[PDB]
Amino acid sequence: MDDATPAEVIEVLKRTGMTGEVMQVKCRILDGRDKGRILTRNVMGPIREGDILMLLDTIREAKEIRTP
């Protein structure tokens, strides 16, 4: 229904001024099935601990090996 769970930024990762393009922040699951789940993602804009982010289930891709 909600897909993503409501959470508030707890920790922010900031290293030096401009060194990339997108800023990354740390947030911890405030509620959900996992709860306490902390995930890090790159988000553009001045966002620091205290903000609210959405936790969407990440799908893992399978790596295929190609032989000659």
From Swiss-Prot:
- The domain of life is Archaea
Q: Which cysteines are joined by disulfide bonds?
A: none
Keywords associated with the record: Ribonucleoprotein, Ribosomal protein
What Gene Ontology terms describe what this protein does at the molecular function level?
Answer: structural constituent of ribosome
A GO CC annotation given for this chain:
cytosolic small ribosomal subunit
Q: Which NCBIfam families match?
A: PRK04007.1
Q: What is this protein called?
A: Small ribosomal subunit protein eS28
